[PDB]
Amino acid sequence: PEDFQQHEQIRRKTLKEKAIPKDQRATTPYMTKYERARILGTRALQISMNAPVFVDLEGETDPLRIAMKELAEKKIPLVIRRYLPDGSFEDWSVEELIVD
Amino acid sequence: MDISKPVGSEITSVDFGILTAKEIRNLSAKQITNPTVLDNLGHPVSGGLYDLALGAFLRNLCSTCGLDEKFCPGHQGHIELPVPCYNPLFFNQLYIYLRASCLFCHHFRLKSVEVHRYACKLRLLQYGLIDESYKLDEITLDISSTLLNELKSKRSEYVDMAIAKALSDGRTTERGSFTATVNDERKKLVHEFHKKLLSRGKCDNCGMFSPKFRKDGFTKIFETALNEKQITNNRVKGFISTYILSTEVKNILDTVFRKEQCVLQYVFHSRPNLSRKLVKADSFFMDVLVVPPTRFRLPSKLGEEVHENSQNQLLSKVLTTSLLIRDLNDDLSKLRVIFSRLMNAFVTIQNDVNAFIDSTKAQGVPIPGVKQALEKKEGLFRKHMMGKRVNYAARSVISPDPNIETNEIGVPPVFAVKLTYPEPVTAYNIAELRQAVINGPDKWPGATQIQNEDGSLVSLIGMSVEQRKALANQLLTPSSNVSTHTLNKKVYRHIKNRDVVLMNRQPTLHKASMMGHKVRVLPNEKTLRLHYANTGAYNADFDGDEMNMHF
Amino acid sequence: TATTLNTPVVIHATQLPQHVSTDEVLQFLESFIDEKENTNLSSSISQLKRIQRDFKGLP
Amino acid sequence: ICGTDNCPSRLWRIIDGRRTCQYGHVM
Amino acid sequence: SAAMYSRFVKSALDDLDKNDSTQIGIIANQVALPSKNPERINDKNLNILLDILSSNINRIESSRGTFLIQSIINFEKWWELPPHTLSKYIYFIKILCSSIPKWWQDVSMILVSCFILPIKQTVCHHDMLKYFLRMIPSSMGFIDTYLAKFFPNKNDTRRKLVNYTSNLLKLRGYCSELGFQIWSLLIEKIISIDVELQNELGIKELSTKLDSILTLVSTHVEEQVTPESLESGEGVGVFNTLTTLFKTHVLPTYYTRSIQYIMFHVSQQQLELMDSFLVTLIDISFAVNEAAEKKIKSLQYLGSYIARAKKLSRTQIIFVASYLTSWLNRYVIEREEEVDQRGGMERFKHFYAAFQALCYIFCFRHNIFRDTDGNWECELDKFFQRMVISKFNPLKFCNENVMLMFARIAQQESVAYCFSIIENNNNERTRQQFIDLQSYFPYDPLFLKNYKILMKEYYIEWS
């Protein structure tokens, strides 16, 4: 009980130390080809597990095409945790990232 | 892989270490003592390689977890070696430390100050500080003990300060910094240390000479010759070839690893030893042998003939020799010849486990050892880890087609009725999957199977249109069980015209030879149809070429 | 039965358990039963109502 | 005999590539 | 013998404290034998073995003792033992599950499975379940899953099915709480029968099966929910739970009739049973959130129900329907222009669906909507015409048989006209699922023997 509180404090301290604040973030404002691929795949996976969809799927049966529609209207509720070689990260939302 | 089955725990790192005899004795499911594998009638003999405590075998339930051959993961056992044996993989290392140590003061024959200099340099290298390890050589004051102990103090002071200074900043963590250049500097030192260790003839601590140890191809150590000039100093030591048993070597290294624990702490640890474990000599020795579960030692069945286990042949031979030598040494108590065959048995047991593990480093076709199993041809890592045979894949001769899209692949209906996708049933696709379920596994676009939310599978293969129609009207039914309310049914539906496939034409010399194509099921086809635009990237000519389709 | 979606990965006591008075237990029970009443959980509330009933009355 | 909650009924049928119970399930 | 055996066991136990375990095992093996084998331990010796074991159960609570115990729990047809001996078996089990409440799990499972046996052969099983549910309330968990595990399949023998429900009813009568898992089992099983009967529409089998089951369920409900039981009882609670479960399974129930009647029938036992359940349907009908298909299914249920029931107030029904129709005036107002706007008349499936149900209800209960004066309740004369001439043009988009029957009747009653509107309609002359959904009426007449007779008091046949 006492040894866990210390372990949790260290875990959350290290997390905060690695997190790059919204202002200090310096990566590409563009969503990488890889980010787009995973977002569409993961959101499709969520859609197939009866997750609340934020778009009107006009006769759409493919979850990926639904995930594609949600991306077009920037309604995908996901965040990209961009890691750097030291372990530090930049949290970028799907909404704010520029898509070609 | 099931999306309905997520995993909450993950392996973040793997730690390499040696199993201790005490550790194996506790985890062991049964002690293996019998060289026979089967009793009469056909039941596994108690204390043998096929014991049911090592897992379920011969339609019998496991005597440890109680599960059958399917669900039982198998259990590890152990063989109690009557005498300690040299571990083949670490023999070369224990040999280096045996030749490097003094047989009198039981310290390495290299001067303590020089040994401490290596321990200091290797401690600073546990953390990413190479510059500091070289700066230690600059710390300088036949030499008196009061002066040399001050040098060891000043060096230890610099090591403790340089670590703390770098630890204060983001230069090194408590777990220590480790890079390839750091690794290069460590590898250089550990090499130089062993080279300096082996070079010394007369012990620098106590001036007495130790008898040189010689070795053969097999794991066996022996004594050396000795000229008259060497004799004249081994007799003044007190004034101021013969085989050596495994126990004698272990006992020599036991004291040396205790007396020289400080340097060996950093010689054997790449990063700081946070576990604070003692570096013991018994890690290089085997007092027990772990018996892998029956699951990984099953007898190979080829048609009608059931081959004796490849592993059980040499392993039973080791047990026969072990039981024969422990009894041939027991009748000696009520006592030359008995010592001759005792020593000869001590050799054939070390060579038995050596044969149990490796060949080219045995004999001179013998049974392959565990080293041989990991390096059979290309090796277990290359043949079964870096590369693997896969499910949901097909192979066929490619035929040209200009009527399909340049991003498409013409899939024969033969493949379309076998290759299925696990499609979870939802409100948006209940209509599409109900039809597939009715259609079944032989009518495209159909479905071969249906997975319920409880985790069970219902095959649609044997069923008629009547049962399929009933199951289709039961696809979107709400889960009564609260433990699976999160889940929804899955339909293992035929590959449709909206699916992705990985087309591969070997050799895959560049990533363009493995692209993603859009499935286009073409009726009355027996070959994979491919457009002419793809010919270049795959370097595929329609001269009877073959292509792999991955789903 | 005993899956990642059913049972948690790990449970850890963040602090030592602090004892609660008869009135605090009864105040908690009343608060919990009212919030949950507002599928197999119903049988657990049925048992919880018996504890609340025992901490102030007789069965 | 399989032994599953389900009941086999005997007469197990071998399908090349798939060994199924005549009844409920297939290994 | 008598005292020789007392020695034999007393020895066996000493021998067990020494771990020899042979003597016991000899005994266990002797008790484990089948009800048929003459060589199975006889009553008198068993009387002895039992009374000795009960007297110090702690002597046996060991790994060595496991096999013996397992052999007594697995004693074939123990309920078929003798009085005095039966009593010793019971006392033993009682004693056993007390210290190591670990065997109650095994004992009760076998008990529940015996629910397929007549109304008599289970008394002992229920007596025991009642006892230990009380003293070990935590058991309700795994023993509930047993309720699942041991249900007989639809294919399995009728005697198995009919028994396993007879017992569940018996269980219900001493463990009121467990209730839900039971009701879930009955519901899950009845849907199986209804669904299958539809699809199929051996069969002679399912008939008398499903018949034996429903007639049972409904008679228990005729009893169990009762006015006395509704004010101070668990009849009211049962009714609520049942209603929710029923709607939910039926609510989403797909194209099939054979169970939804259970509610048709219990409903009409008492005025309030009709009331509250009906209000639940009203709550279903006009929630904004529900599937375009859920609202339409409910509306079919709603219309079929009002038409067919028998224990109705003329007036509790009609006024709500009139309010819904005024609900109708709003729908058209907040939507025709939604009509002359972009889209099709399908945008309004749900409107027609409800208007159908109401029209249908008027067909069967017409003669009722004329009050003493000869005037129409809800101004049906003036009301129907307004919808018929609206821009939605209901007559074109609703059913092909109700709209016709409404025409016939409405015209006859001077309530509304239509044969010219029909002429105009067929002159001017995912879409299928809708036509499918609009063809199904969950309370069109039933097809079963006893139930039918029982429903008569609650049913209006077309005749």
Next chain:
Amino acid sequence: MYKTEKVDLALNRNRGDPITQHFGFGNDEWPKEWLEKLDEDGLPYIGTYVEEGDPICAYFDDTLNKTKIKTYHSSEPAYIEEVNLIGDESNKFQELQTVSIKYRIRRTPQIGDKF
């Protein structure tokens, strides 16, 4: 395309051991519809169409006291062109279990065949 198979009953027996095996069908035990492919002698009717799983021959071994069959297995279906019964030699006496069966596999030019 013609393919020949040798069904030898000397597969386990050696050095003139007593035999439990014999071409034909054993009495009392007979699994359903096998007579459609094989004749009374246990050998197949020359001309019969066979698919993988179909019985290509029938025998009875006394060691198992059951009537077993040697199955035909190939992706390509065939017809029986020739069945030859062969004497076992070994000082004669013994009945002819042994047997050479020729399959006729029809091969029309398919998409993929080289010309």
Next chain:
Amino acid sequence: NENRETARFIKKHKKQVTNPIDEKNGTSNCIVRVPIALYVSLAPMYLENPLQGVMKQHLNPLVMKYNNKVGGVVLGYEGLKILDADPLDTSEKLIKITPDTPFGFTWCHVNLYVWQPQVGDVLEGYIFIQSASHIGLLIHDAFNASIKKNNIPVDWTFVHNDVELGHWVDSNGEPIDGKLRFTVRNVHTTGRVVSVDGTLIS
């Protein structure tokens, strides 16, 4: 080193907080409040309402059932708090999703009210049944308790009824009252329902 290794094992099985006998009642308080940290899965159906997820999925099947970690029976939970995967003001938090599946996993903080009865603790229960070899009881009329024949005093004598069931008589020579006070001899968790093995002699 001889006793240093064994010392870690004693602290693993050491009773963290003992149950005290108070208010001259003679009975020991076993209901306790313990704040815990969970690592739970979040279904994609609960992606818009995550707190309802953690509750219906993992916390609801936890109540009125013994949990090995807290060392008692979870009577309920209070104040659920999802730990944001992003260290930061708003109600919108984020949870890490598995690369393979659409399910996410998160750390949670919730206070549990548990019934923690250790051995040696004096408890009261209402006599449910009373056989010749055991006495059935109910702690707070919800938790099962049993006192075996050997755990009952020697002076006590059982009397079986012939009419229709039995009754136990105490040392004084009178039948035992509805409620009975006993000491905790052992607590059985492994089974379906929590059963307390009680003693009437010390």
Next chain:
Amino acid sequence: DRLLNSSDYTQASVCRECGSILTTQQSVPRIGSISTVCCRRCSMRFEDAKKGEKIFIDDSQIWEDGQGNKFVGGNETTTVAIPFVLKYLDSELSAMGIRLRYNVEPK
């Protein structure tokens, strides 16, 4: 998908305390009790667990095997998705006396 998911993907039990896939086993329960994944390495033999005052085992810590032996502890086991060859490799490495320790998060 190719080298794991559609090849030898196995959800395997691992002990968080010692980091191994080969020491974990399903415990054999009593008539009413449920089976729990337990580690043979970290668990102590019941009899060997000997004893400030006397301490008592919380019952949930005692598990039994098929041989009837009682054990104390070794309940800090979880599930991880791994390739099956890893299990065969770890097994082979163990024969050679080499131990693989899998550091598994969360702890």
Next chain:
Amino acid sequence: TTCQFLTKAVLDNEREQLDSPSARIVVGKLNNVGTGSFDVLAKVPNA
């Protein structure tokens, strides 16, 4: 030389950080290249 590199690893008491494509494949971990060079987190509205 699988057993040779393994021996050198054990003697170093080395920790395989599982950061190389090969190591990740060995332990069934997702490769850190391309789509594995980041993490995907879901935005949840309730506190």
